């Protein structure tokens, strides 16, 4: 993946977004923007240029699953990688993530090493 790939980090908790942003920076990914929920995320995605989405599961107004489906059902955004992050892994949510087209699914908290591993799995799958 290009070091300048533009990420959108979506989470309703500002501190979690900051942490993810810092982990990305530690990996060399400096081009990162934030969104506080699915609606806000879609609004910023309309600006174009994004190449990777990392989204939390539980958020008001539009949660992560809802955001993921919206992205996958949109002609211009349908191919964007989306890594789901969740406070708790439940079989039902994992199966839901797969059905909706999640590129990845990771339980927080996670280290930079784990983030790198999950990103690389996605890059490899998609030929990025």
């Amino acid at each position: 993946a290009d070091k300048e790939l533009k990420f959108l980090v979506v989470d309703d908790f500002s501190t979690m977004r900051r942490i993810v942003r810092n982990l990305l920076k530690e990996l060399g990914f400096n081009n990162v923007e934030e969104a506080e929920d699915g609606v806000d995320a879609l609004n910023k995605l309309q600006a174009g240029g994004f190449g990777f989405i990392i989204s939390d599961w539980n958020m008001p107004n539009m949660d992560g699953l809802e955001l993921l489906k919206t992205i996958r059902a949109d002609s211009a955004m349908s191919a964007l990688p989306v890594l789901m992050v969740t406070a708790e892994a439940k079989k039902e949510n994992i199966i839901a993530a797969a059905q909706a087209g999640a590129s990845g699914y990771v339980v927080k908290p996670f280290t930079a090493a784990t983030l790198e591993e999950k990103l690389n799995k996605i890059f490899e799958k998609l030929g990025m």
């Binding site: 892994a89 079989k91 994992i94 999640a102 990845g104 699914y105 999950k118």
Partner: peptide, 10 residues
């Protein structure tokens, strides 16, 4: 859980 995640490629 982990076997599911692993089987799905997550």
């Amino acid at each position: 859980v982990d076997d599911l995640l692993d089987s799905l490629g997550f």
